[PDB]
Every structure is written in structure tokens, then in C-alpha cells.
Homo-oligomer: A and B are copies of this chain.
Amino acid sequence: ADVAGTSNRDFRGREQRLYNSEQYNYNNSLNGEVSLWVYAYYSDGSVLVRNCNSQYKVGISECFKSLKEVRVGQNNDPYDEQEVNNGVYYPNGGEPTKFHSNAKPRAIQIIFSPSVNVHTIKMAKGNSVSIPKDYLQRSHPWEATGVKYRKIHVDGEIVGYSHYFELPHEYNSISLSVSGVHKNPSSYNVAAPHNIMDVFQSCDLALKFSNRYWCELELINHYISAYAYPYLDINNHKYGVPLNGRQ
């Protein structure tokens, strides 16, 4: 046989490159996943991830309470934190023993898989009682924020998209929903009658994941890297696995 890495008959080499290319392009096919991660960062350094993986379109919807840090199996002062909720839903509306709950997110990162079309991204960053813009009567139910999404590049390939905003002020008390649609460069509407019921089933079939990791290092190591997910850390370091045309 020919010698490895010296000719066009390194079929092992060609097959490796095709395997990676097939995965990248399958993901971008209408058969492929579109994935969304919402990361809530807490002052103790831990990070809640909410993930959804689905065909055609994907989303996550959270309220003020559901974004708050919960240390499973540890003390979370639930009565006091309910009083925090009451005090955040209406000024002077509760009697907690604290001014600022350390369970409040300090920041949010939204990351999409590279199979999203950024022009379809929508976000409702609402107030603490789940209104998009102060009052329902004046609220568009979303903002289209795609132009703010940064490309996560690795080795010249887009491995994902990130929108990051901090919540450093005392009044940064939010509710949050996010939605994105899978790329479709064809003119075949996946939600027209020939395929519409499959998009309804995709709403059923969407897989969700949630966990609170004790720090960003642990998240990077045992979540992001373990499962070939894209990420951007606090030092602007990019994570992900480039696949198209690559060995």
C-alpha cells in the first residue's frame, strides 16, 4: 500500500476528514439539532446551565425565581428567599434579612449552536414579574438581538454564537426567554403543511438539561469540553471543536 500522509490514497485520512465534515454538515441539515444554552453566573462562582436541544427551532423560558441559585441538598434559606422574591416583585414588598440576594444572577450568557440562523434569534429580557417592557400594553413580546451575537471562532470555524450581558446593578432583576430557529437556506418551509406536524412533535421531543456547576473551570471541563459544546469564558477564551473539512 501507499505510505501514510504522502499521497491521495490515504483513505484513512480522507475518511477522517469526511467523518468530521459529515457531522458539521449534518448538524446544519434540517435533520439536525439546533441547541441553546443559557448560563446564569452567581457571585459564589457557580454557574447554572439551562440547555435545550431540538430540531427546527429551540428555546428556553425562565422567570426571576427560576434563574436564582439553588444549592441542591444545602441550605437555601427558602423562606427568606421567598421574601426576597416578594421584595423584588414590588419595592418594599417583602421582609427578607438582606438587601441583595446572592442567589441573583450576576450575568447571563446565551450561546447557540452553529446551526442557528442568527436573524431568527429572539429574546424577552423582562422585569421581575415577567413583563417584557415594564407594562404589557407597551410590550413587544421579544427583541431581535442577533446583531449583538459574537461568533465563537476556533481554527477559523464558527463553532457557536454568544450574547453576554452582565447584571451588576441592584435593579438588574430579570425574567428571560430566548428562541432561535435552525438554519434553513432552502425555500422549503419546515412548518408548512407537508411537515408542520413534525415541528409540533419537535416541541414534544426537545431534550432539556439543567445543572449548577460549582465553577467555570468545572463547567468547561465536565460539560462544555466533554460534549463538544461551544463556550466563551470570562477571559474571552473560545472553546469548541472545528469540524468542517478538518481531520
Contacts and interface: CB of A to CB of B under 8 A. Distances in A.
Interface string A25-47: 01100011101000000000000
A223 B200 CA distance: 29
Given A27-B137, A35-B136, A204 B58 contact: yes
Contact of A201 (B31, B138, B181): B181
A23 interface: yes
Contacts of A54: 141
A80 B138 CA distance: 45
Contact of A228 (B135, B175, B181, B229): B135
B63 A208 contact: yes
B210 A65 contact: yes
A57 to B, nearest CB: 5
A207 interface: yes
Interface string A179-221: 1010000000111110011011111111111110000000001
B177 A140 contact: no
Nearest to A191: B196
Interface residues of A, number: 85
Contacts of A168: none
A68 B35 CA distance: 24
A54 B122 CA distance: 13
- Copies of the chain in the assembly: 3
Interface in A48-101: 51, 53-61, 63, 65, 72-74, 77-82, 85-86, 89-90, 93
A210 B79 CA distance: 16
A169 interface: no
Nearest to A176: B207
B79 A207 contact: no
A57 B200 contact: yes
A122 B56 CA distance: 15
A210 B66 CA distance: 10
Interface stretch (A3-11, A124-132, A145-153, A231-239): A124-132
Given A33-B132, A61-B205, 20 more contacts: A26-B137, A31-B140, A53-B141, A55-B142, A57-B197, A61-B206, A61-B208, A63-B207, A72-B82, A73-B78, A120-B197, A131-B207, A131-B227, A136-B228, A175-B209, A177-B205, A179-B205, A181-B201, A189-B196, A189-B197
